Amino acid sequence: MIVVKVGGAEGINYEAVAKDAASLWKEGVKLLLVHGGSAETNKVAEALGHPPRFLTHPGGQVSRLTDRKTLEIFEMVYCGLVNKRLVELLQKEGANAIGLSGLDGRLFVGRRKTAVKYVENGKVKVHRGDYTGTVEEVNKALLDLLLQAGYLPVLTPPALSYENEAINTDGDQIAALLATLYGAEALVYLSNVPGLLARYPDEASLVREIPVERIEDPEYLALAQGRMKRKVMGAVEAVRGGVKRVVFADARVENPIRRALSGEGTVVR
Amino acid sequence: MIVVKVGGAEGINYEAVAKDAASLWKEGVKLLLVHGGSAETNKVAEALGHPPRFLTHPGGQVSRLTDRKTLEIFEMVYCGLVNKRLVELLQKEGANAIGLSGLDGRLFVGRRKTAVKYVENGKVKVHRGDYTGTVEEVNKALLDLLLQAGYLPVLTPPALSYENEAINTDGDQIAALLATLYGAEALVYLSNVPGLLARYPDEASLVREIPVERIEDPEYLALAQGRMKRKVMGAVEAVRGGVKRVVFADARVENPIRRALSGEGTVVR
Ligand SMILES: Nc1ncnc2c1ncn2[C@@H]1O[C@H](COP(=O)(O)OP(=O)(O)O)[C@@H](O)[C@H]1O
Ligand SMILES: Nc1ncnc2c1ncn2[C@@H]1O[C@H](COP(=O)(O)OP(=O)(O)O)[C@@H](O)[C@H]1O
């Protein structure tokens, strides 16, 4: 099992990712693809006159306000535009992809944050209509069933809350969760940069290797505390959880997945 | 097997349809739900600044121009907004729904019209970038597989062309095709009117029964040739194909499916 998380930032080469995934699948490789689409969602939300709004936490720590209308646009883009673009591209390449959201078959379920603190005009308030949460359970039976039948699952949020509400959630954590549940050989994170890097945006700052043995060393403190903490420690937890390696790699280049599997990027192990 | 086609016109009561479908499913009834969303697609397309455009055929006979950008908005709304709204609603009602498009698992495949004649300024032209076609094949194995595992499939176009291109297609024909493939006990068409009616919009013109024995009678010529020909003859072909009855019913009212199954509307047999 390989799990490939495709990021949703600008300049993701979907046709390049599709071409690679499809040829891996055709070679007999087990794949699970997870994707996003936050950039395209914003663009669509701008155009529909419902611009993105962000909650600044008492930290903080900013997170998208996923009100119902924002969630709906999230659904249009993640579940509609991107999911089906990716499925179509895969079918053109000879891979029988099947696109699913966390709502479908109760694939992804978790807890909704029903009261989130934020700071507006220097006063702290409580937002009760934010549809965001975690993923704590996966319908692995369904994924297993589709995998056994030979389909290539292409998965996306939103997830389903325990009260059956669609909720936004962290796509990187879904991918990490899937990778640990399946004991994945590799978990690949693709994005519009070459990998984890010390001086962003300089692409020669690329860190090649992060041994989980040495995660609490000062060398690797810089990243584990800096901008990309959530991803880095998610990877560390995944490897500890049984995933043999986690690779951060480039989604722009040709053969993004193959290069990543050959170690080109940041390898957490 | 019951197949319920939910229309995509204004004022479709999705929560009412969901409530009914879910309680039927919980009673052990086999359901396949097919839906659309042409009205909401138009509204979204208006707002995105890509207004609907129609091709007037040499007849004609008008049909939506489904250029790639229109197809993408079609995907956002049918596959994103509506499909997931419906799946969420079903999950809230205790039914384990699974939403799929024709692209997913190659569920719906057919032939694309790659050159459509139209009349513009009284001159006949040929449009070569229209992504519309038929559905000729269904991945019944996949549907069977999901049905056996107990999921409630919620299906939608677009379909996949034989050249692996996403294409718009007639949702009513998909539902008719599914109903004949499964030998459905009933095929229900739900829309924002009480049924097939002689003097539209007068709702007392409701035709209760159309015997397929008498389809070529002058009485039933009015409908079989009039505004709703494609639906009426699709129903007639379905019943001949082995479907025991086809009901045209109201999507607005409470218990829309149950009422339809009890004969409330236009019953083709
Ligand atoms: N300088 C940067 N270095 C690393 N990551 C970044 C940088 N700037 C933005 N990002 C990441 O890009 C992400 C876009 O979301 P992502 O998880 O890729 O897709 P989605 O949320 O659509 O699944 C942001 O959450 C952010 O963490
Ligand atoms: N007066 C009318 N009587 C019957 N049907 C109508 C009338 N006016 C419009 N319609 C139907 O409403 C349909 C909307 O599309 P529909 O098939 O319900 O959903 P979708 O295309 O979204 O699956 C139109 O194709 C049209 O045939």
UniProtKB/Swiss-Prot annotation, chains A, B:
The record marks 5, 231 as: Transition state stabilizer. It is found in: Cytoplasm. Changing residue 113 to E: Loss of activity. CDD domains: AAK_NAGK-UC (cd04251). Changing residue 112 to E: Shows reduced activity. Belongs to the acetylglutamate kinase family. LysZ subfamily. This is [LysW]-aminoadipate kinase. The lineage of its organism: Bacteria, Thermotogati, Deinococcota, Deinococci, Thermales. The gene is lysZ.
